[PDB]
Amino acid sequence: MNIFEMLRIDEGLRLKIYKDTEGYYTIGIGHLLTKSPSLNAAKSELDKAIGRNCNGVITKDEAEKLFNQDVDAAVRGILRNAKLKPVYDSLDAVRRCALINMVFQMGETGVAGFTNSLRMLQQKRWDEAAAALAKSRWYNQTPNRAKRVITTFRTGTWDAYK
């Protein structure tokens, strides 16, 4: 099980524009196009992103090229961020995927706001961290994917995805 398989499980795969759980226009493997209400602002974002007139529809390969990009972006953003980098440095390989997950989903900034949780991860206090993470809107909005990730951090195993 790797980061790509973990996120394919978490976000699904869709070849036509769609709305995410928060109502925003998405495509492929949780690739956020726009926050804007405009289905038209979304088709343009899409074409900008693919480099073709897509008309809200893409291929699998395309969907995969975008995923490649986003995961890479997610990793480079952690490794560059002052609050995130030390945490990641301190983690084992499995818990590392867990922080990649959260960052792909909520961006660097939002994950960087979970101060206390970050602190307990870095200190290796698994149960405490799991407890704080849960006290979040994130947990309340997408509880199943959240518990999965939260379990990844508590355990250090792929149990929850297996």
DSSP H or E stretch at residue 11:
helix 3-11
Instruction: Please enumerate in sequence order all residues whose Cβ is within 8 A of that of 35, keeping only pairs 6 or more positions apart, or say none.
Output: 24
Q: What is the smallest separation between the CB atom of 121 and Cl ion, expressed in angstroms?
A: 10
Residue 103 identity (one-letter amino acid): V
Q: Assign residue 107 a region: left if phi > 0, alpha if psi is -120 to 50, beta otherwise?
A: left
- Bridge partners of 31, per DSSP, are 27
Q: What is the smallest separation between the CB atom of 57 and Cl ion, expressed in angstroms?
A: 26
Find where tokens 């398989």 sit.
Answer: 5
Q: Which is nearer to Cl ion, 47 or 126 (CB)?
A: 126
**Where in the sequence numbering do the catalytic residues fall?**
11, 20
Q: Which is nearer to Cl ion, 22 or 92 (CB)?
A: 22
Footprint on this chain of Cl ion (rule: CB under 5 A): 114, 116-117, 132, 135, 142, 144-145
Q: What is the smallest separation between the CB atom of 34 and Cl ion, expressed in angstroms?
A: 22
Q: Which is nearer to Cl ion, 80 or 135 (CB)?
A: 135
DSSP H or E stretch at residue 25:
strand 25-28
